[PDB]
Structure formats: structure tokens, C-alpha cells
Amino acid sequence: SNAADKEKMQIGKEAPNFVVTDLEGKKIELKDLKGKGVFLNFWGTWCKPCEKEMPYMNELYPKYKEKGVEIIALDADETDIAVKNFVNQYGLKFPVAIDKGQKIIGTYGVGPLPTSFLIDKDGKVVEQIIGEQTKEQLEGYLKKITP
């Protein structure tokens, strides 16, 4: 079997590492991002609260990226075509990746979408956030994990 079968997300403890390819073909490994805050967002193109908040994230991203915060938007296993088209129409600049198999979703215990996790520079999960957030709200979270 695999040890990751029994990996577990705990508030105030190290995030379950994962490895995905983003839509620009680039490798993301969560552990590689130690030194940065990470806003880990689980989403979908059909989820209206996800759709409405993602422009907000997009307007916040340049601001917080320089400050060493990464946004990783994990899509809930839709097609490459459905997702590339969504990202395209919105002009998203932050990393987007499809969680093939919904594996990472399972590891993270995600049900309702959208769900976000705040991961700080140590790679510790500090907060789990459920439901659509406002731009003001999102910026708050992003400040909370600025390195």
C-alpha cells in the first residue's frame, strides 16, 4: 500500500504534501513552497461561489505574490478543456491545477466547495475556510500568511 493512504490534515500542524502539474505545465510540490505563505483553494467551474470569488483572488494575487504568498487553485477533477477555458475567460494569473483523482481533496477532507486552507511559511495549516468569501475577507487571509 502507500503511507499517504493514512495522511491527515491537522490545524496547527504540517500540511499534507502533494505534487501536481499546473496548467502551465509546471511542477508544484507543497513542501517546496516552505518560505512562502500558501493560499490553497479547492474549486470548480460549476460552483457559483467559486466563480464569483476567483476574480477577487486574481486582483489580490499580484499584491501578495511579491510578498511571498502563493495561491494554488486546485480544481476538483474537471476536464482540461473545461478548466483551461474557464481560466482563459477570467485571465487568472495564479497557479491552477487539476486534482486528478480528487486525491488531494480526499486527503484534505474537502466536501463543500469552495474550501480554502491557509498554510504559513513553516508549511503548517493554520486555518480552514469554507464557503464564498469577499475580497476584503480574502485579503485578510492573505495578510495572515504573509511571510
Side-chain angles (χ1 to χ4, degrees), residues 45-117:
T45 67
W46 82 90
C47 157
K48 184 75 156 32
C50 301
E51 149 205 331
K52 189 186 169 139
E53 68 184 2
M54 290 172 90
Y56 304 154
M57 291 161 54
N58 204 48
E59 304 164 355
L60 294 169
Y61 183 66
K63 192 171 180 172
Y64 287 81
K65 188 191 186 176
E66 184 68 24
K67 299 190 192 300
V69 177
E70 184 68 291
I71 297 186
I72 302 174
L74 294 182
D75 168 78
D77 209 6
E78 300 182 74
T79 52
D80 298 13
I81 278 187
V83 183
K84 286 170 170 284
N85 283 283
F86 185 95
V87 166
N88 188 51
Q89 77 176 71
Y90 283 101
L92 304 179
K93 289 311 169 194
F94 49 79
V96 170
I98 297 179
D99 171 27
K100 299 301 187 166
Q102 292 204 351
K103 316 221 103 196
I104 299 166
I105 275 159
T107 290
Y108 276 78
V110 171
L113 296 175
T115 295
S116 298
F117 296 85

Side-chain angles (χ1 to χ4, degrees), residues 97-146:
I98 297 179
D99 171 27
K100 299 301 187 166
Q102 292 204 351
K103 316 221 103 196
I104 299 166
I105 275 159
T107 290
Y108 276 78
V110 171
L113 296 175
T115 295
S116 298
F117 296 85
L118 308 195
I119 295 173
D120 73 6
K121 52 162 175 271
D122 293 340
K124 302 287 185 55
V125 176
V126 174
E127 181 165 4
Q128 153 185 234
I129 308 167
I130 294 161
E132 201 197 314
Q133 315 282 316
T134 62
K135 183 177 177 173
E136 186 174 302
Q137 258 166 319
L138 291 162
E139 177 151 21
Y141 303 133
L142 300 180
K143 280 197 187 306
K144 298 179 208 167
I145 57 176
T146 293

